[PDB]
Symmetry: D3
Subunit: 284 residues, 6 copies
């Protein structure tokens, strides 16, 4: 009778809510009034209005946002009949080609639904060709069974969603109104190849000579950052973190994250050879 899409919607779309600050979608994940959405939906208003698909409206309190992840948590007070809940899936089970259903509640009285698949898997955003629109953003992304596997964002036609397993790791902290830790050092960085460095040094108009190595080229030192304060300059080649050699910027990020906030890291750089200690700080 019903397609599998209409069925998944029937499972999880009741709990998809409209969110208005004076706008987008979110979804209730616990009978106690915990609601997930995007930071772009709510921030920086601390007061929102939630509307259930059934037309019940609630005074929503923004519990906190994490701009780095584009996630926020809103709480409402469960009065009267029980709040419908969307069941959460696991995004680590996704495969490219899995069905993907994007549900909004932009009006408050019905769901908006679009269908597509998982297009890419890496925030490590899920990519999908399920059309993602305003108002549909901040709503859930379901798998074929109707479980939440992600949170739509309005970021072609390809759309991005925050994997659910990332929200599930951040949810406690955001509900408590705390700051999610995001350590960084503040450089735009690029993996540099020796063929790329010799190629660079052949060009009379490259901005700077590069020491013909496999490394992490500092492309830019962001203002106000630990990297600027440590004295790092554009054109520096990062050759290793403390001891371990590196040629991959993505690996450097993971070393900085595993360090934590307010940790000193020692960097091996070429400018000459130069070691500098950077104090990780919170990305803002």
């Amino acid at each position: 009778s019903e397609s599998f899409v209409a069925a998944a919607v029937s499972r999880s779309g009741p709990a998809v809510v409209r969110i208005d600050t004076e706008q987008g979608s979110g979804f209730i994940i616990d009978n106690s009034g915990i609601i997930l959405t995007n930071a772009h939906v709510v921030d920086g208003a601390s007061k929102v209005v939630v509307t259930l698909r059934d037309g019940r409206t609630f005074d929503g309190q923004v519990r906190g946002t994490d701009e780095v992840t584009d996630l926020a948590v809103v709480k409402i007070e469960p009065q009267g009949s029980a709040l419908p809940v969307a069941p959460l899936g696991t995004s680590s089970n996704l495969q490219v080609g899995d069905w993907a259903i994007a549900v909004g509640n932009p009006v408050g009285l019905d769901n908006t639904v679009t269908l597509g698949i998982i297009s890419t898997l890496g925030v490590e955003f899920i990519q999908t060709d399920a059309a993602i629109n305003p108002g549909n953003a901040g709503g859930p992304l379901l798998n074929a069974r109707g479980e939440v596997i992600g949170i739509n964002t309005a970021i072609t036609g390809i759309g991005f969603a925050i994997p659910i397993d990332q929200a599930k790791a951040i949810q406690n902290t955001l509900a408590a109104g705390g700051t999610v830790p995001h350590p960084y050092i503040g450089v735009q960085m690029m993996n540099i190849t020796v063929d790329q460095a010799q190629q660079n040094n052949r060009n009379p108009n490259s901005p700077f000579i590069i020491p013909e190595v496999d490394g992490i080229l500092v492309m830019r030192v962001l203002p106000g950052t630990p990297a600027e304060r440590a004295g790092i300059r554009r054109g520096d080649v990062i050759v290793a973190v403390d001891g371990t050699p590196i040629s991959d910027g993505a690996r450097l990020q993971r070393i900085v994250e595993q360090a934590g906030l307010n940790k000193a890291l020692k960097l091996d750089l070429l400018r000459r050879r130069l070691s500098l200690t950077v104090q990780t700080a919170q990305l803002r």
Copy 2:
């Protein structure tokens, strides 16, 4: 062998025609030469050319259009072999998430087909993420079985279709060349909340003070309308139709429609308190 899409197409795509005035698609709904399409396809030409998927061309007479609904009826003369017919479904059975197939015949010799789902259900347009293109517009929107459930229009990526059950109510009148009745009074109107009226009255630069009530705020009086002729002004709050209180613009529309053409309605308004009688007229 064939997917369900290819099957539905085989059922109803024979009857999808190309329409040219010197362009878009339509479909034959009766063996006697009755064809449905959009008003935007044909109007305001009274003579079109119809081409069947099989390459037979016919001199088409536009029987009439309804611009308010975006619907038109074209008739051809069934000579020779029988005209293929698309079977009509029922749009009141649709659910969000149901499959949706948009078929055109822009060239005249083959169908254009796109696949998506029903995205929203409210003209109360069907929304679909089945890509709707020029030339594909005015063609049918099928369900998974191949029955017509709507009429594509070229109005993201989200597309709009006129539900079939609306055409089926208008079809006799348009085929006879009559005017479909569309009574209105000629106001852009907005539901006003007391928190919205107090919020409005807090702003030194709101255009006008609003009497702090739940009502229908007149946002604009359209020129040449029954509302202008009755003396209604921007900033009037409609408080009730005759007797019945109202705070919903959508409800006012339904009262005006249920009235009919050339009917006097009594409006309760705040400007002071003021009653005015409006004479419904045909929307054009």
Copy 3:
């Protein structure tokens, strides 16, 4: 467990490669290192870099391109473990409405996948509503079983793909570095109807009077072509090829192709009545 999309991807996505000249996708079609892609991906670089989904990189030699078809062949040297291969389907079995899966490898370490259907069938491009993006272009278009039925191009939302059976006819020639033959004469041409010619001649501002016939109107003589060299002018009506009457430009194309390169064709034209011989030349 896996949808049919995820399964087809598992079948053929291993062989989808990233292609970089200093960018797009291609796919290995033979264990000996033969790779297909678009001409737009590679041309006019004769050296590219191929990356398999598994992260193995190869020094790719562009074997040749055919700009008219938008096809190119790249060869790599199969060292070590065997190159994964995508199985080729047959595009003459496609029907509109058949599922269509567009696979890229833009990064080199994973597939990009989008889902849609066959939208049109006529280069006679496959049209699909499977979203086709940069980086996803030059990759394969699969059927529901995972066989290659086409080659994506970045040419709405509707996308174009080169049918596989066309590549399969060109592949030997391109791999050998030869030129695919594309004979033409160099006219923009239009089928002219007597109602269209009388309609034209009614307009005081038509550029030229047309002899009120069914023919092939020469709309433009391209510079440097066999048609310019034969003396053909804009406004000429082609009435027949040698002996056979013609009113269809598409038929004229097929007569010129069946002729071959450096073949004289005799054209019957109205300007007066005038016969001219054109020497087919290679389209560039």
Copy 4:
């Protein structure tokens, strides 16, 4: 003490008025309330408001406009103190390089003045590099002595002015509310040279072959005109008016004007050779 500009302004700027319909400048040319301005200033309002530099306001009646010349006449009722008057010069005495002073009264309480020279002399517009602005348009253009030699228009930096001697020929008719005669036939026409016709006929993509002559090529037949009604077509070469040969479009214009309204002219044309009679009509 005063430059010659300030002196000319003192002479004629009192009579420069502001004109508002709910805007631009004009000037009083007779103590009885006759005011000149542009058609663009006033049309198509029949009621304007005039303001003298001294702040006196008058209810102005538009007496008529001539859109072809961009001239209009406004009348006011001289009550109280006498209306200041600008003295009229003669534009046939102008030479290129003569000083030119453009005066407006956009506000109503002061003049706007700009200085430049006569740049070109051919409506046969005076060109000047005296900056001509909105509000300054419709005001007078003075010579170094302060006499009106033209009427500014807002048509680089080069500005256009209607020569005074043209207004002086139209003024009686416009004041009486009559229509100024402007006979025409309705063709965009071009002088054609034999080198230009042979050059044209060499181009395979010229719209039409031209009979290799010195003539008046009809470039376009305007819709609704005497030329369309006479059957003239684009690509016709006009070879002579009745009897007199012609190769100059500007000469043809003067023959049509000297004819008058509703006069039959016989045209010698090449299409073949063809004579057609055209009935001059009023340009609108």
Copy 5:
């Protein structure tokens, strides 16, 4: 030998300086290092570099700016040979049509000079058609004798200059680093006519009914102003200042200025009839 322009330049152009913060022109008005320019040239840098036409460079201290007037004063230390000085004229002697010469020193080693006239006389800006360019802005505007009558700004082709007599009234205060007083109340205001109020009240879509009077219509209440704090709303009609009736916004401005800073004014308003006291504050 020299035109009068070249002579005036020789008189005052020596003292025209280039001003750079890391740009525009200024001029020395006193042998002690006092320099005038625009606020837009310098603000908000407190340190600039001055260059004399002779190539001497000085470390300039910005003494203060008045953004409302677009004026600033820069001081340098007169070492060595005496600073050249431009003599100041009087702008109250200007007449429209007087010659006007705009001098810059954008490079530092020569003057830029343009010639035009005084176009309008009302900050009450001088308008001129002497071309005013970047780098030429902040330099002096001379009369035919070479005296400074204004200060160019880069605010068609019409240019604006600050009259010298306004600078001369502000110069002491700016040199001392004080704030020039600019009292205001914070309303966009419009003179309203009874024909304009009846015309307004005829329009069903005017934002508000106007009490059919000659007054000062409050068009907007600027945020953060004395008018917002006094409770004035858009659509209020100001009928009088304390006691004196008013229908002219320009007159209200002069009453507020003559009041001074931190003065209470009583306003007669229609909304009903309503009196409100406003506390003048400094325009920023």
Copy 6:
């Protein structure tokens, strides 16, 4: 009777010609048919048509162009009545503020004239606020007496003219069809200050560290130039030509010009310290 502008025009405007290749102005400078104009007017056509203000047309031969100066020489054959000639002035006598008159002949039958002054004096272009338009470009720029002091170009409102004394130095060579020598080395170069180099080195994102000196910073090495072939790189600081120190790019240009074509220059550079020999080549 006539202003001084009309008089200068009468002196030199007869010799101002229209130039068409299938457009702009030029002027006859010798009774033997020598005509000056801009390179932009004619190049790269070797055949033009000249029209005298009196309506005589001549077959013009382009004798050569110098793109670096924007100058060209056209020759015609003096048949019949004598060619009118414009007398040449001397641009080294110009002063800023001197009157300047720009004359064109765009139509062929009259002059276009605009008036302004000399705005700047440095190709070392004359700047003027005499409006310079298409068609007026390539015509002469006169002084108040009517002598040619420059050649208008269509390069605000400020216009550029080539000083006559530069043409007079190039004229023989261009008339003979030779190449004017323009030696260069091919660097975009900038005077660098120690405060600018320390300022640069403070910025973490400057492309390169600069050795804290007064020099000539190489900003860019143009492709295909003597500088690229000598191995000069972006970021090099030129410290001296052979022996003589330099901190001024304009001085370096004059040393290269005084060298001539195909001369070796020795450059002192910082990169380290480095000397390189550059072979001057012709600027193209």
